[PDB]
Amino acid sequence: TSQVRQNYHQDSEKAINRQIRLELYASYVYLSMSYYFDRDDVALKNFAKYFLHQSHEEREHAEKLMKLQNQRGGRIFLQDIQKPDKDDWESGLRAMEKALKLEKKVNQSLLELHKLATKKNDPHLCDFIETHYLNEQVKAIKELGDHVTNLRKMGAPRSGLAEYLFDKHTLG
């Protein structure tokens, strides 16, 4: 047992490792999306920037969990980071929709982790999740919803005009 460990259940430790993995996966999905918009045959530079920024943010999310794991005297164990589910993300709209789905999946995981932390009477871990993750998820999901809504209302994905103008005026 680590000399620092106190009130940290092994199940919470193991779940924090799985969340680190999910954060690294979300980073990889966004990196994929970013470079999809960087293709010469897609060429939406502000979509590309947006998703790259998101990819770097997910890596910070992962790193803060790894720090947490050591702060609590848990031990990080890493697994493969699986490739994202698509290579071609189809359109600005379709990528935003997949991102929305991803953020809701990461949120579900965080809510299940918080439910475990509660059952294990770990208020430090509860506060960690609430403070650093849960409102970040709500804000992300809201933003992505707003983006989907505007793209759909503008006529996307069939209107390439819509996606060009959203790139410039919302993401730019």
Query: Binding site, residues?
Result: 23, 58, 61, 103, 137
One symbol per residue from 1 to 40: x for binding Fe ion (CB under 5 A), - otherwise; what is it?
----------------------x-----------------
Give, as ranges, the residues between 23 and 82 that touch Mg ion (CB under 5 A): 54, 57
Cβ 12 vs Cβ 122: under 8 Å? yes
| Integer Cα distance of 106 and 24 in angstroms | 11
Closest listed residue to residue 109, CA positions, set 58, 152, 34, 161:
58
Q: Please write down the long-range contacts of 35-38, taking CB distance under 8 Å and 24 or more positions apart.
A: 36/88, 36/89, 36/95, 37/89, 37/92, 37/95
Give, as ranges, the residues between 26 and 55 that touch a copy of itself (CB under 8 A): 28, 31-32, 35-36, 38-43, 45, 52
Instruction: Look up residue 109 and give its amino acid.
Output: S
ω before 157 within 30° of 0 (cis)?
A: yes
Residue 78 interacting entry, from Fe ion, a copy of itself, Mg ion, none, C-beta within 5 to 8 Å by type: a copy of itself
Closest CB to a copy of itself among residues 11, 67: 67
- Candidates 6-14, 74-82, 133-141, 155-163: pick the segment binding Mg ion (CB under 5 A): 133-141
Closest CB to a copy of itself among residues 14, 169: 169
